[PDB]
Write a protein that binds this DNA or RNA. Structure first.
Lengths: 356, 14, 96, 177, 156, 93
RNA sequence: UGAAGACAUUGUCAGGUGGGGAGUUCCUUUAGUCCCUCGAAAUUUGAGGCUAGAGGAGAAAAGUUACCACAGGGAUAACUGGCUUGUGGCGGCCAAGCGUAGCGACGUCGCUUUUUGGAUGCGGCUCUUCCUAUCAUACCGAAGCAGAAUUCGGUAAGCGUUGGAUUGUUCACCCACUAAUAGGGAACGUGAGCUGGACCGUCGUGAGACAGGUUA
RNA sequence: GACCCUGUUGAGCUUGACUCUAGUUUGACAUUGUGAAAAGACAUAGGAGGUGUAGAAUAGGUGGGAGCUUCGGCGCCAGUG
């Protein structure tokens, strides 16, 4: 049908939902208006009914509309400057002299530059080829800044297919220590190794084991980072497949895997550490079924760990309760991220300290 | 409107 | 590496020798400048390792991973001539 | 993962000495009583700390993919090769150095031998077939290769004339992407 | 399909960096400027139409000497669905098999009867698991070298 | 104080809007506001139809009367065509 | 007899790896009973288990490629010659025949393809002759063709048939006169005249160099 | 020009047995004591508690429950969940 008419009707239904007591109908109810909004928004933005529900019921109406506008709009581009080779103002000056529009990414990160436009392919600049910056995202900036690693430790990156997180951790540790970067598939591991050698990291070991196995292969790492593979409900613009390729079986199977990987990270961490016993769990989805029901499974099955403050600058605080599921009061510290509020892909970050 | 004015990396140059 | 070791020597050397190396480092910063300014600017500090003081070789000592902190001692060293040499040092560093 | 044998390190150190000046520093012990070693996984060679190698020995042979810095690969004929991954050590301890302008660095990044028209700074007293690391005027290491002529012949050479044969450029990072 | 694309393009368009890398022809010219002595026939341009994908890519030494011109490069194909009898212009995802030459398959040469991977997002094909298809096989059934267009039939 | 009057056509309207973007000022079309500040607001409107017509009739009469003015008008018409053809384009938005 | 100090060191099990040393010749897929175990969620799943097909002499090296560089060998050694020109390809429907399902013209529908008005990377002058695929001049047919100026088409080669701007050059576009300022052929040498390299040798092999020699 | 093949080379892919084990590495247990200063988990007796969205309103949760009664306010019912 006329999607222009449907989006106008979406706006009208949002207004009616917002002022139902004043602006109403003869007998049409809250459920009827919400379900009409469901069909309209599914038909317009092209979502499966199940996922469109989870998202509309997770968000307030105007916030949901802005959220889907954000999911449909692409993000501005952003790079991480490698402190291993150069620093922010020098790289910025080089690119400005070369013809690239750069600005500081913000006051929240001292290692990032936001890129607006250029007349040169940013994937071909000599400093890029030499490893002065990496094409990354702020949502992947966040997890390492949650798990700030200090010099001379043993760290475990559970899934490092792109390589940005491992390179950021190595840059923070100043090419000291040992970083085990496991990545289940070989094809992504090739690009990972290329990225590491381009950025110049000498304290990394690339593996290819099922991450649900690291307490058997080594165990006892000082710091653990787990970017759990999830549905990707926050990377909708990058991967439009998620709009309809996530069904009930997926939202049932994906959590189970996240649950087991988080248990494995808990087991592999070391409680008796002179510098850190910390685990940072991140996922690229915005669905309670996968982001916070899993942290609970950790605090309800392993009493040897405790939630600790992430120290990340901004955001809107985490969900302490949902539909019938009440969580440990401790979840509040977990901070969630969304694209409409901040032009940052919607991800979750939780931070763990082991005691036993 | 529904955004934090403090940290919202925009699209146009500043 | 020689600049930083010379600053340490200046902290722990008699006064006339102290002013001697202060003037010598005045000369080296006059001649070289940009080559060494990273040793005074902290935001130009390299993060590619940790400074190793007791190195067996100059390149083994990674000198760009640390910065000159000796001013807070040389500004309060008892010798007025040493203080004047130091202030000339930071004057040249600032006028670089 | 195995340590190199006598002939294999003979060849590897021959290549590293053909493009580098000091190697006792390369094999020198560190402050924490640790040293860099040489290991071979599959057919590629690797420069890595002994502690890292001993902590990486748990990974099954078929499950290891990278260790430290990849310095190149041994060939079916038993002949070593260097790589853009082996560049940074050469930059750290280079024997000869050549600096190219931007309009030649961009060619060298696409994989072309440098010529006199693009060179802008030289090292005096350089043999004809020597080991030169290719930088720009901002001293970012861009590659490594063998000079075509000596220094004097480079001066008196036609500006449209090869001076350094490419052997490895940074573009391979855009290959393994 | 066309109204869906039109409304998406009309509304959801915001500035974002997109610049194409310089092409293989001037890259080859630069390599020639770097190398004086030209071996006879060191260049051979690929005359059959090709599909590449990424704007800029450094090819391995093995295939670094095949030149694919931009005027011959294609990126979309007219794909026909038989059961839902309709032709749609769809993007080309990848070349899976060219049954004339393995080298042609590797380089992306686009000939007759050629299996390609095509994006089937706009059709809305529902799978057995109820799922939505995003890519399928299509046999190119014409001769793009003679007809300046690519026509394929979906294998469904 | 200075006065700036600019004649704009429908074809030049995109360039007017580009001017708006460059100056960062608000656009007031016709009489949407009772007292638009012409100095800080880009205010666009038409003209007194009555005299506008009594002036256009005068222009038509002088073009019909003086042949040199008619030849000049035809030359500027050709120049307008060429200048429109060679002038730099506007932006899509 | 002194010093260090409840940390090291050391020992026993459970494990990971082991291209080194000694001896001998486990996982993944498929189909099934809804038969058993573990994990998750509650009103269902995922991983194993069983049945029997398919995958993974031995650290010496081995096998392989429509690929690359060098070296060599073999076939091929020019090539168009009732060739060329104005109307796209793909798929569906339809469809006379033929045929007893297969082939299938013209049309129509879908893609390219729509709801508001620079390309190019050997060229350029004077003169002769021929073609018509005709720009003008001559004569016709049609057109809201009132007149004027025209548009399309037909017969027609008797007669005429450019110049500026830009570019390395050309065309396109644009600018000017003019009745108009058409396109081509002179037959693998495109009318007549004129003008603007490969073989060896030495030394390197991740690329090549030689005022080294020889030669059509 | 181009095509086929051969030798060397480069790029790439595959195979390169099994059982113990040196080396290497993880976890647990043990020598092994006397005290003091802190933290956690177990032991009671207590005290304070529950703000995703919507709902008027800060809904631990479950059970019974249509009448309750400091006898005027509530329930129920209508939502909203």
């Amino acid at each position: 049908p006329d999607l222009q008419m449907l989006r106008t009707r979406i706006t009208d239904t949002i207004r009616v939902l917002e002022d139902f007591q004043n602006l109403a109908e003869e007998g049409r109810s809250r459920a009827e208006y919400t379900n009409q909004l469901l069909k309209d928004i599914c038909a317009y933005y092209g979502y499966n009914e199940y996922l469109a529900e989870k998202l509309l019921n997770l968000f307030p109406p105007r916030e949901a509309f802005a959220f889907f506008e954000a999911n449909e709009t692409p993000r501005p581009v952003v790079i991480r400057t490698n402190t291993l080779r150069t620093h922010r103002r020098d790289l910025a000056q080089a690119l400005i002299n070369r013809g690239v529009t750069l600005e500081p990414v913000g006051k929240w990160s001292k290692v990032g530059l936001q890129v607006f436009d250029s007349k040169v392919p940013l994937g071909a600049t000599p400093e890029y080829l030499a490893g002065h910056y990496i094409l990354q995202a702020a949502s992947s900036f966040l997890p390492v800044m949650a798990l700030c690693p200090q010099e001379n430790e043993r760290c475990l990156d559970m899934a490092a297919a792109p390589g940005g997180k491992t390179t950021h951790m190595a840059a923070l540790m100043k090419n000291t220590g040992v970083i085990f970067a496991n990545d289940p598939s070989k094809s992504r591991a090739k690009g990972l190794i290329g990225n590491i050698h381009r950025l110049g990291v000498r304290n990394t070991i690339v593996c290819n084991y099922d991450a649900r196995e690291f307490p058997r292969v080594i165990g006892g790492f000082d710091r653990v980072l787990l970017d759990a593979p999830c549905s990707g409900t926050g990377v909708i613009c990058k991967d439009p497949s998620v709009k309809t390729n996530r069904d009930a079986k997926d939202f049932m199977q994906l959590p189970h895997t996240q649950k087991q990987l988080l248990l494995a990270a808990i087991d592999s961490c070391n409680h008796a550490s002179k510098t850190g016993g910390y685990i940072v769990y991140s996922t690229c989805s915005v669905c309670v079924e996968e982001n916070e029901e899993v942290v609970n499974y950790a605090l309800s099955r392993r009493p040897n760990v405790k939630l600790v403050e992430t120290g990340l600058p901004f955001g809107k605080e985490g969900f302490t309760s949902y539909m019938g599921k009440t969580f440990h009061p401790s979840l509040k510290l977990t901070r969630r991220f969304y694209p409409h509020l901040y032009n940052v892909d919607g991800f979750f970050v939780a931070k763990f300290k082991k005691i036993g | 409107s529904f955004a934090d004015p403090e940290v919202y990396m925009s699209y146009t140059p500043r | 590496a020689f600049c930083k070791q010379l600053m340490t020597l200046a902290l722990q050397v008699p006064e006339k020798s102290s002013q001697a190396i202060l003037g010598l480092l005045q000369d080296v910063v006059h001649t070289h400048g940009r080559k060494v300014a990273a040793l005074w600017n902290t935001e130009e500090r390299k993060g590619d390792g940790t400074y190793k003081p007791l190195s067996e070789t100059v390149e083994g000592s990674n000198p760009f991973t640390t910065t000159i902190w000796e001013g807070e001692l040389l500004r309060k060293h008892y010798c007025p001539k040493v203080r004047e040499g130091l202030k000339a040092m930071e004057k040249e560093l600032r006028s670089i | 993962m195995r340590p190199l044998t006598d002939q294999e390190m003979k060849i590897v150190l021959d290549k590293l000495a053909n493009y580098m000046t000091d190697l006792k520093s390369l094999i020198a012990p560190l402050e924490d009583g640790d040293r860099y070693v040489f290991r071979m996984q599959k057919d590629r060679v690797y420069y890595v700390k002994l502690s890292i190698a001993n902590i990486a020995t748990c990974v099954a042979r078929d499950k290891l993919l990278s260790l430290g810095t990849c310095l190149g690969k041994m060939t079916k004929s038993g002949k070593f090769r260097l790589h853009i991954t082996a560049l940074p050590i050469l930059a750290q301890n280079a024997r000869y150095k050549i600096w190219v302008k931007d309009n030649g660095a961009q060619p060298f990044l696409y994989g072309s031998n440098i010529v006199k028209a693009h060179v802008g700074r030289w090292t005096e007293d350089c043999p004809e077939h020597s080991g030169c690391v290719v930088y720009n005027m901002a001293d970012i290491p861009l590659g490594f290769g063998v000079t075509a002529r000596s220094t004097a012949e480079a001066r008196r050479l036609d500006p449209t004339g090869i001076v350094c044969f490419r052997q490895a450029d940074c573009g391979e990072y855009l290959r393994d992407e | 399909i066309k109204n869906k694309r039109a409304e998406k393009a009309a509304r959801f368009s915001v500035p974002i960096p997109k610049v194409r890398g310089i092409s293989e022809e001037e890259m080859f010219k630069v390599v020639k400027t770097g190398k004086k002595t030209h071996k006879k026939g060191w260049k051979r341009i690929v005359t059959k139409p090709t599909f590449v994908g990424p704007d800029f890519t450094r090819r391995p030494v093995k295939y670094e000497r095949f030149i694919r011109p931009m005027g011959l490069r294609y990126k979309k194909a007219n794909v026909t669905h038989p059961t839902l009898n309709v032709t749609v212009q769809l993007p080309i995802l990848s070349v899976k098999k060219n049954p004339s030459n393995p080298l042609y398959t590797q380089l992306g040469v686009l000939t007759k009867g050629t299996i390609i991977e095509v994006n089937v997002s706009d059709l809305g094909i529902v799978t057995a698991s109820g799922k939505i298809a995003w890519g399928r096989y299509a046999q190119i059934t014409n001769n793009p070298e003679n007809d300046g267009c690519v026509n394929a039939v979906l294998l469904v | 104080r200075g006065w700036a009057y600019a004649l704009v056509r429908e074809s030049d309207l995109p360039y007017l809007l580009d001017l708006q973007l460059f100056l960062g000022r608000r656009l007031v079309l016709g009489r949407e506001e009772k007292d638009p500040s012409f100095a800080r607001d880009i205010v666009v409107g038409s003209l007194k139809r009555v005299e506008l017509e009594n002036n256009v009739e005068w222009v038509n009469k002088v073009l019909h009367e003086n042949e040199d003015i008619g030849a000049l008008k035809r030359v500027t018409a050709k120049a307008e065509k060429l200048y429109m053809k060679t002038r730099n384009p506007a932006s899509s938005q």
